């Protein structure tokens, strides 16, 4: 099974460097080339560069100076390094592989790496319960005051997906993000079942399991 | 660089209907065009390569056509799982460039929201901040009003809204309105109400609690 897994979501200071590692499996880096594509509010999808099977590199014109792609065929790792980041470099970065070794139709993508360019510091969130009180009970978690994005939220270690709504993060006036994740369950299961939201803010290594009970 | 113009910006159809996405190039690119699907929080997914060639695992309801400058991605019978953005990519010219994409929305029957109100937890009140959350769950269309009242006083400027993207199964939206107060303000008042206005309701629905039950 062909896969590409990128390193964790990161904060980058203005005018500093960005480093992402693409670890691949299901194929060899000696047979296929690895491309790099980003996605930004202002520029949409944008082709950045590619390292080929033989190690040759092509960089898109406006990145030739500050872009640098390397790899380790043995460790199956591709190394993306861009210099001198500014605010409009804030985007989601992907590594990708084409169908055939020489081509550009991207059939395989990394899960993406949300890069935020800011001078601000990283802050882990606080997790608060949204306690429940027609036979259907609503409950959730309040993930508040964190920076930067993103934060991952699951329920009961992934076992609970039905009825789950994780809202988009909103930017507070404090410059810190905040979101809520909810889920509807049968009210008769509040005594039998345990409900835990699994919160993970990788930029700050904050990993919290919050048990949500009726008050 | 080749400029790819996708039209329209937004497409709104109903399940079972045919739909066509346009992608126009600044100059002739033959048939060197690829299509992509991107669902919420996902990476681009390859749908069609070289204008019309099919891709493994991709539903047969997806097809493409066109040559030169005018291209078309087609879905003969839209399903609720088709809710996504759709991008086109050219590679007849270096460097490969992508279009701005087309948003696909789905229509459905009017669904009234289920409303739930959540008082601030005692855990958060220790921080000196209080968050009162109002939940509008599984409704359609997206348009909705949330009015906050604290002791009959209209709240304004102290609330924020977040709306989920369209659900891939029932094509509904869910909304969360969060009223943010200081712990001092919250303790000075009793009745916290959340009024919801929506097309699926013949009357505004109000969920409220008295602080400390």
């Amino acid at each position: 099974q062909v896969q590409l897994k990128q390193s964790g979501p990161g904060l980058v200071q203005p005018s500093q460097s960005l480093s992402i590692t693409c670890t691949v499996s299901g194929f060899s880096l000696t047979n296929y080339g690895v491309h790099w594509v980003r996605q930004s509010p202002g520029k949409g999808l944008e082709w950045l560069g590619v390292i080929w099977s033989g190690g040759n590199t092509d960089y898109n014109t406006p990145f030739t100076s500050r872009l640098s792609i390397n790899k380790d065929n043995s460790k199956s790792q591709v190394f993306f390094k861009m210099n001198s980041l500014q605010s409009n470099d804030t985007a989601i970065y992907y590594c990708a592989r084409a169908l055939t070794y020489y081509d550009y139709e991207f059939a395989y993508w990394g899960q993406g790496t949300l890069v935020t360019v800011s001078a601000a510091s990283t802050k882990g969130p606080s997790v608060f319960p949204l306690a429940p009180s027609g036979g259907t009970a609503a409950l959730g978690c309040l993930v508040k005051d964190y920076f930067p994005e993103p934060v991952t939220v699951s329920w009961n270690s992934g076992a609970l997906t039905s009825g789950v709504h994780t809202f988009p993060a909103v930017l507070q006036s404090s410059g810190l993000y905040s979101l809520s994740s909810v889920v509807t369950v049968p009210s008769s299961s509040l005594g039998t079942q345990t409900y835990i939201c699994n919160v993970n803010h990788k930029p700050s290594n904050t990993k919290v399991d919050k048990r949500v009970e009726p008050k | 660089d080749i400029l790819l113009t996708q039209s329209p910006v937004i497409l709104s159809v109903s399940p079972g209907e045919r739909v066509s996405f346009s992608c126009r190039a600044s100059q002739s690119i033959g048939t060197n065009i690829h299509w992509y699907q991107q669902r919420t929080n996902g990476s681009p997914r390859l749908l069609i390569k070289y204008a019309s060639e099919s891709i493994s695992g991709i539903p047969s309801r997806f097809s493409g056509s066109g040559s030169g400058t005018d291209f078309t991605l087609s879905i003969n019978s839209v399903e609720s799982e088709d809710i996504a953005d759709y991008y086109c990519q050219q590679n007849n010219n270096w460097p490969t460039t992508f279009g701005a994409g087309t948003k696909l929305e789905l229509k459905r029957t009017v669904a009234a929201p289920s409303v739930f109100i959540f008082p601030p937890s005692d855990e958060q009140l220790k921080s000196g901040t209080a968050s009162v959350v109002c939940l509008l769950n599984n409704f359609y269309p997206r348009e909705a009003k949330v009015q906050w009242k604290v002791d009959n006083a209209l709240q304004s400027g102290n609330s924020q809204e977040s709306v989920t993207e369209q659900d891939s199964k029932d094509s509904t939206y869910s909304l969360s309105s969060t009223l943010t107060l200081s712990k001092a303000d919250y303790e000075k008042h009793k009745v916290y109400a959340c009024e919801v206005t929506h097309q699926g309701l013949s009357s505004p629905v109000t969920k409220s609690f008295n602080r400390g039950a």
């Binding site: 996605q39 930004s40 509010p41 202002g42 949409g44 804030t90 985007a91 989601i92 993406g112 949300l114 994005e149 993103p150 988009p168 993060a169 | 910006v9 991107q38 919420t40 929080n41 996902g42 990476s43 996504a84 953005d85 994409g101 948003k103 993207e165």
Partner: peptide, 10 residues
């Protein structure tokens, strides 16, 4: 225009 939060166009 693309939204980094939802990876969707607004």
């Amino acid at each position: 225009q693309f939204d980094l939060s939802t990876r969707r166009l607004k």
